[PDB]
Amino acid sequence: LLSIFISTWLTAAGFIHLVENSGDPWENFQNNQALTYWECVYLLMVTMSTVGYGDVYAKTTLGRLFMVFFILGGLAMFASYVPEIIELIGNRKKYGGSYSAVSGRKHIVVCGHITLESVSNFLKDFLHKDRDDVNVEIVFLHNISPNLELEALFKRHFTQVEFYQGSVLNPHDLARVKIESADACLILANKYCADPDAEDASNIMRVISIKNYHPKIRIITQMLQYHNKAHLLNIPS
Amino acid sequence: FALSIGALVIYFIDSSNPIESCQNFYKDFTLQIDMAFNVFFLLYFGLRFIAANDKLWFWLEVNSVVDFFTVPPVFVSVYLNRSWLGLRFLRALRLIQFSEILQFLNILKTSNSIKLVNLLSIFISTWLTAAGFIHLVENSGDPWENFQNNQALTYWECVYLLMVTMSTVGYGDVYAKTTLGRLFMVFFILGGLAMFASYVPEIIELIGNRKKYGGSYSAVSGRKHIVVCGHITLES
Amino acid sequence: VSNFLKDFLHKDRDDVNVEIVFLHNISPNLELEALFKRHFTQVEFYQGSVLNPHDLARVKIESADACLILANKYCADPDAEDASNIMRVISIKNYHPKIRIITQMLQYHNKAHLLNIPSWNWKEGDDAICLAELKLGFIAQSCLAQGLSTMLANLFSMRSFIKIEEDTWQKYYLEGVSNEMYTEYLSSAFVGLSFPTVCELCFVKLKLLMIAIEYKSANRESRILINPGNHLKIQEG
Amino acid sequence: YEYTEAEDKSIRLGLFLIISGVVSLFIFGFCWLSPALQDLQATEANCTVLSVQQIGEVFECTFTCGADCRGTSQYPCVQVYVNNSESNSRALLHSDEHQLLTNPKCSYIPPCKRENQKNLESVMNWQQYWKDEIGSQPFTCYFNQHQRPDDVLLHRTHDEIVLLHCFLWPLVTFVVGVLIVVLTICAKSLAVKAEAMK
Amino acid sequence: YEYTEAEDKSIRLGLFLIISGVVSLFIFGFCWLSPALQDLQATEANCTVLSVQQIGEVFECTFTCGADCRGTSQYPCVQVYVNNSESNSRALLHSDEHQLLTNPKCSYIPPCKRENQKNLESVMNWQQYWKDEIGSQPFTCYFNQHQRPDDVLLHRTHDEIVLLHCFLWPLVTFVVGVLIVVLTICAKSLAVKAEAMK
Amino acid sequence: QRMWWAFLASSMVTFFGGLFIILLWRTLKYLWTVCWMTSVKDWAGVMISAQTLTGRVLVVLV
Numbered sequence A: 001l002l003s004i005f006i007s008t009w010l011t012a013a014g015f016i017h018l019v020e021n022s023g024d025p026w027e028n029f030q031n032n033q034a035l036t037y038w039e040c041v042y043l044l045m046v047t048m049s050t051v052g053y054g055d056v057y058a059k060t061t062l063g064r065l066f067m068v069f070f071i072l073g074g075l076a077m078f079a080s081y082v083p084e085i086i087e088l089i090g091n092r093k094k095y096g097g098s099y100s101a102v103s104g105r106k107h108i109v110v111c112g113h114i115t116l117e118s119v120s121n122f123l124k125d126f127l128h129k130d131r132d133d134v135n136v137e138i139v140f141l142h143n144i145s146p147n148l149e150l151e152a153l154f155k156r157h158f159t160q161v162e163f164y165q166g167s168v169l170n171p172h173d174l175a176r177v178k179i180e181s182a183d184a185c186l187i188l189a190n191k192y193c194a195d196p197d198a199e200d201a202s203n204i205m206r207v208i209s210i211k212n213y214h215p216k217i218r219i220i221t222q223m224l225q226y227h228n229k230a231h232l233l234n235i236p237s
Numbered sequence B: 001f002a003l004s005i006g007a008l009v010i011y012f013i014d015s016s017n018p019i020e021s022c023q024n025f026y027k028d029f030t031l032q033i034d035m036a037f038n039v040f041f042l043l044y045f046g047l048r049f050i051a052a053n054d055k056l057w058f059w060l061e062v063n064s065v066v067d068f069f070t071v072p073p074v075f076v077s078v079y080l081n082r083s084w085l086g087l088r089f090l091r092a093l094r095l096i097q098f099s100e101i102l103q104f105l106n107i108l109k110t111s112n113s114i115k116l117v118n119l120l121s122i123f124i125s126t127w128l129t130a131a132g133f134i135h136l137v138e139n140s141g142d143p144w145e146n147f148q149n150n151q152a153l154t155y156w157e158c159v160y161l162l163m164v165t166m167s168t169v170g171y172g173d174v175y176a177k178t179t180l181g182r183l184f185m186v187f188f189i190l191g192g193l194a195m196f197a198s199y200v201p202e203i204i205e206l207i208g209n210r211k212k213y214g215g216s217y218s219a220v221s222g223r224k225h226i227v228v229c230g231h232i233t234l235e236s
Numbered sequence C: 001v002s003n004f005l006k007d008f009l010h011k012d013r014d015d016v017n018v019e020i021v022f023l024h025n026i027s028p029n030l031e032l033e034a035l036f037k038r039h040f041t042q043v044e045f046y047q048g049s050v051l052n053p054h055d056l057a058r059v060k061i062e063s064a065d066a067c068l069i070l071a072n073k074y075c076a077d078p079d080a081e082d083a084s085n086i087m088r089v090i091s092i093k094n095y096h097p098k099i100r101i102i103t104q105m106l107q108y109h110n111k112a113h114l115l116n117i118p119s120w121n122w123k124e125g126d127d128a129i130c131l132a133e134l135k136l137g138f139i140a141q142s143c144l145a146q147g148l149s150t151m152l153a154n155l156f157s158m159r160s161f162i163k164i165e166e167d168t169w170q171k172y173y174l175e176g177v178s179n180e181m182y183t184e185y186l187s188s189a190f191v192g193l194s195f196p197t198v199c200e201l202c203f204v205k206l207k208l209l210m211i212a213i214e215y216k217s218a219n220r221e222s223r224i225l226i227n228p229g230n231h232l233k234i235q236e237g
Numbered sequence D, E: 001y002e003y004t005e006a007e008d009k010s011i012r013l014g015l016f017l018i019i020s021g022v023v024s025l026f027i028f029g030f031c032w033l034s035p036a037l038q039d040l041q042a043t044e045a046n047c048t049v050l051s052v053q054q055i056g057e058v059f060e061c062t063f064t065c066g067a068d069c070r071g072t073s074q075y076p077c078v079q080v081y082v083n084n085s086e087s088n089s090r091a092l093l094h095s096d097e098h099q100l101l102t103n104p105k106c107s108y109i110p111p112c113k114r115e116n117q118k119n120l121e122s123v124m125n126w127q128q129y130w131k132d133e134i135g136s137q138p139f140t141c142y143f144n145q146h147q148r149p150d151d152v153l154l155h156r157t158h159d160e161i162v163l164l165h166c167f168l169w170p171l172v173t174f175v176v177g178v179l180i181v182v183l184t185i186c187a188k189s190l191a192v193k194a195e196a197m198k
Numbered sequence F: 001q002r003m004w005w006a007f008l009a010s011s012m013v014t015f016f017g018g019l020f021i022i023l024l025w026r027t028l029k030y031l032w033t034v035c036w037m038t039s040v041k042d043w044a045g046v047m048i049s050a051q052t053l054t055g056r057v058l059v060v061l062v
Ligand SMILES: CC(C)CCC[C@@H](C)[C@H]1CC[C@H]2[C@@H]3CC=C4C[C@@H](O)CC[C@]4(C)[C@H]3CC[C@]12C
Pocket: E165, E169, E172, E173, F005, F006, F008, F009, F012
């Protein structure tokens, strides 16, 4: 894109330089405008950006004609060539990156099912004013992107709550949430699900992944069934 | 339509002249071909005036309104043997039928092409019509100034003025120096931003959809390529 | 839509001033938009149902020469679709009764409901095409004579004649593809003549292959008699 | 019963003239009348010629050939002081405001010609008309006691008819814009009520 | 049987010249011919020198050094009035319209030099050519009875060939644009029909 | 004298002269039908290809 832009710009500047050094031939080459090539380059950069100072402009009829054609051509390949290729270089995802390990701030990674309901109660008790001074920052890792109610609730706590998109079944995501340095990880299970055992096994899978990444960690988890609790005991760490 | 283009070229020739001049039979073979074109125009909106299922609806379609500010001044001009460069630029508004006549010659067979030539035709016709209007204003003066602040613009200088204006470039080398001219430039900047924000930009974006997985494979010699089909996903 | 458009807009159809207007609630997909943008002065789509009187007025059904109702061949319940098409017939015949309607019926048993509707008239040209009956019958009749389905399909379908010079099977095949079926009153010189004699005179002297006939005399309506004997003479009408 | 599109566009055209009949009246009220009534403020006096002299200062006029020539010759200046009747003071004559606003120091800008002698003789020919008729036959002369305390005009910039066409033709456009709307409604009401006389 | 992309781009190039052969003809019809035929309107007269004088008014020329110098010297003026044959009036001479449009009051703008004496001698050397040859040998001289009623040219702004190149080279571009399209179709038709001679 | 014209004349005669030669050679080859060119695309033809390194260095140098 930058090459076709610079090449088109210098080529058209050379063209209207060649026109303006000479004159209108029916005027017997008498209305010549002694422009430098780089004055002409300045003219086209002022023109294509629709700034148009008018200090430098084409004073020949053939020059005015080419400036009309090149304004139309510039608005052609700006509305048809770049603006669907500019917008291929504009997509950004707003939940990525990693966690800034601030010294003194013990951060908690919260994973598991995350929703306005489950997250709200935990945030309210953890961030309650009576909790007084606790340097713990809750970092939430969930594959699903937060809904607008979640975005409002996360934008009620700035230096206190960060969301990140990703699983805890991928080691890189655990590194991104800095699980190894994290004081503890809390796994929240959706209370309502089609099968209780399936969710319980998913939370046990998340426990196994985190304890396989970094074994010396506290994990507080939720279990929907009492019988599924034994699997955690079976895990060695 | 072709004789309408010819009448527009006659207007472009006559725009290199003063306000009026007295003739009898020839000065540049000026009115001699213009009378023939306008008699044919009179005959053309004659036989379709009787083709009106609604005599009022035909009267207010702007396809004889273009054919209607032109022909009676031509008849007055041949009755008085003098010319006038009045509302003859309105003949350029009949360029809106360019896609319709170009469809007849089997040149365009694509709805994108028909819509594109309709957009370019309404753009060029509006631009030349408004250029003729503010040309007519600036050749004369402000009448309360007793026609003394006339700006001797060529028609094509004025065309350059409107192309510099509508693209919001605005060099200021050429500009309207009359009060009525400034008023029409205000109205036409508002009208140009009206039909750029309301007429084209949902029709421009009908000619902007592209799919990013199509085409074919470039058979590079020496590169044996494998086609992989079946279920395709990040995992597999 | 594609098969119907291809047969209706086939080049061999020559000059027919019929414009196909399609009314469907669902907006056309990109393939439909391409197919509708392959025919400009010939095909128009409109969004709307035929169960709303205003939409029928918008498609100008009253002035329309005929309305063709197409049923999705593949559906979860055949009867439900058949009842929807019968509902569409009832709506159109309630708007404007003097109209021809050609419809598709997925089941043979559902065809009786159209007869129950009062406005529908078979003699008036209203016709219901039963996909299940016709397809199974073409397969059945072909169980008797292997290849009858191709012969019957090549009769009514407008198919492009292609000149083949080389001695292949396609050269002898295309000799009979361009034949079609035609309905025609017999001449007045065939009154009281036997059907084999009339077929002999049609095939010998003017090379026409007559198959069937009308036959009505004060009884039930004029049946289509495929190849009568010398027992039945040809009536004037 | 419905307004047909021939009827509806006539209503849309009829309202377009009622609006533009107001706007063209609204524009010309301060774009045409505001320069007009200031010119009509100066009253007719009946003043006498005080003195007609020259200065010797040249002033550069601009003649032309016709095909866009910018030839600039020069003309001498003549100050015609007159004695007013009403404001009874020593003040110049001016052919119009256009002669006044360009060169207030002169009384008469001649039409500029190529040769200086051609422009010279047009001065003294005009001067001879004012060196023979001095004091006798006091003429009508326009003076304003508000804007120009020492400048007297010989004419007006406009006519009596300048009040007419700024009020007439937008109101002509206004009435015709009403007559389109009224005759559309009345003919429709004769086409919707007299149809049901069955 | 299909147009290949080498064939197709030749068609796209061939149509691009057929269109631009019209447009370049269409541009020059009022951008080149409209100044041309006004210059060809003035006819050849055969006029005699009436009088050659000077004025004393200086006019400021502009010389240069070559490396963008804006030196402005001055030159005296010479009015050469001639007696026309056809319009038989007293009118100036002019070397061309470029001498006419810049200074109509003079007949001969000399090429401006640095010293005023250099520009002075170029006047009188030109003046000596017109103070010895007066009345005798009446010369061809261009005059227009429409635009300039009192200005006679010595030359034209253009040649006879100015009618040629405005009609020639767009039509040269037009025919070559046709010959690309015709020879593309004909060679393809020889490449699609003669292939099947098996 | 001002011989600026011969440059553009040379370039355009090189264009449409050389364009007509390609068309007429593709005319006469398909008109005569009505009534060591092998390795020459391999000496330099492979070299022109970007895949060749010498070819890539040639593209970078030009
Ligand atoms: C754009 C294309 C078609 C233009 C190229 C065509 C060339 C071959 C033609 C166009 C106009 C011609 C020029 C016309 C003016 C002068 C006349 C004289 O002083 C010598 C030759 C010269 C200089 C001609 C040389 C050839 C010429 C330049």
